[PDB]
């Protein structure tokens, strides 16, 4: 299947209390592989998945240098944003960035991303064509005109289609035993009477990877959306994910309900019935 | 593999 590499960075100013805190994390698909935290003692990009520990000392030197440069860049950008928005040096602000690339099953470039948010809102984003910018407000329009005149997008595109894709291909191969593995969900049902005329059926999916999954309850084969209690897919903490869906049913009618489980790691969808 | 930040100035 197709794969993604993503980096997510967060800078948060804290005026009077030193320079902004910068945290960056890198992912391949749903698996984190590196981190950097400007407040941490090491001052190094650090490994967060076993397969990236294969990389030698030059890699860590290189990545540390590059992520620290980003830290400084986003320090600069926080200062500029203050000016663009006419905001005081008193308050704390947040600058986020996401970038990375998608590749198909043969390893070919699919899509690129390069985007910013200021204080939780869209600021500026590279369009899918990787040639054009979307400015979300008047301040970001200043940045957009600056970047258009300087043809900044061309070297951003080069990274997304080049360096990004080559890194992802390398990571996918080095970590193929875990990254290209599929762990299908282990499923079960629970059943709890809540009164003498109603009972809860809860359908569980556990230990699955990747995170994408669909859990659906059907009654007589019909829609149960409004009546389904569904939690957001959540990390187990060991590299896998969990989810459940629950319906309240009339006692004695359990056999009328089916829970449908769809996941990439299943040969065919599962149908569960109490 | 991290990018360079040339061209990232607001």
């Amino acid at each position, epitope marked *: 299947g197709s794969h993604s590499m993503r980096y997510f960075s967060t800078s948060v100013s804290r005026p009077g209390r030193g320079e902004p805190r910068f945290i960056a994390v890198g992912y391949v698909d749903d698996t984190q592989f590196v981190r950097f935290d400007s407040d941490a003692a090491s001052q190094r990009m650090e490994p967060r998945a076993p397969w990236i520990e294969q990389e030698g000392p*030059e890699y860590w030197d*290189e990545e540390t*240098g*590059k992520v*620290k*440069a980003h830290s*400084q*860049t986003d*320090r*600069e950008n926080l200062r500029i944003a203050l000016r663009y928005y006419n905001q005081s040096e008193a308050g704390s602000h947040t600058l986020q960035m996401m970038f990375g690339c998608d590749v198909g099953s043969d390893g070919r470039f699919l899509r690129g991303y390069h985007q910013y948010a200021y204080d939780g809102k869209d600021y500026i984003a590279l369009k899918e064509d990787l040639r054009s910018w979307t400015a979300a407000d008047m301040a970001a329009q200043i940045t957009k005109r600056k970047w258009e005149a*300087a043809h*900044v997008a*061309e*070297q951003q*595109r*080069a*990274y997304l289609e*080049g*360096t990004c894709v*080559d890194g992802l291909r390398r990571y996918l191969e080095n970590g193929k035993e875990t990254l290209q593995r599929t762990d299908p969900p282990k499923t079960h049902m629970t059943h709890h009477p809540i009164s003498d005329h109603e009972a809860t059926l809860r359908c569980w999916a556990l230990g699955f990877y990747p995170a994408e999954i669909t859990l659906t309850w059907q009654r007589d084969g019909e829609d149960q959306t409004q009546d389904t209690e569904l939690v957001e897919t959540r990390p187990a903490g060991d590299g896998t994910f969990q989810k459940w869906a629950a319906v309240v049913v009339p006692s004695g009618e359990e056999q009328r309900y089916t829970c449908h489980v769809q996941h990439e790691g299943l040969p065919k969808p599962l149908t569960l019935r109490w | *593999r991290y990018p*360079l930040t*040339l*061209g990232w*100035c607001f």
Partner: T-cell receptor
Amino acid sequence: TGVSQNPRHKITKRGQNVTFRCDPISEHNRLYWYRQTLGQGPEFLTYFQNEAQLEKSRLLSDRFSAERPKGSFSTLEIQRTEQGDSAMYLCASSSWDTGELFFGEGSRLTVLE
Amino acid sequence: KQEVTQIPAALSVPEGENLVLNCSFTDSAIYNLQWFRQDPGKGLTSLLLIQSSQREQTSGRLNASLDKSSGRSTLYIAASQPGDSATYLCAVRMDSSYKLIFGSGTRLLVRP
């Protein structure tokens, strides 16, 4: 306009300390120090983004140290100069967008016994 | 790991010849390349910058090409003049850091 370095020339006796200064192009966020001897390409010493010293080489040995305390200007100091230190010390700054390096005219050091 | 090579390292040519100067680099993963000229005793003058997404760049009588996968850049000097006599230096910035890595240069003499 251009990158400015001072002093342009410096002669000293072995064991003396020396300090060179670089004033980069104003709007440039990165500053680099290089060392060059006749017939060779410049060799990298260190660079800054704003005040942060983000990379140094092995040629920036213990006697060599640089700082850029406010962003802006940078200082390269060599302690206990030796005749082997004699070289052209070059400073450059680079643009925010292309990262094109623009060099100063250099500080040429001659260390004598 | 990256080695920047400029061969031939010295040239003597008749004025008016359309010249080619060579640069090669062992590691293709470069962000950009910059050509400079240097007169004896002096500093460096930036001539052209080629981004990794560009195949060529031009400025007056100067053109430069870049072939990343082949690890080559060529500086072209059209209608060479005695005033072009100088050392020409090729340098690359890697995808992995911000510094330039320099070749040793090609010394050019253009005879009047």
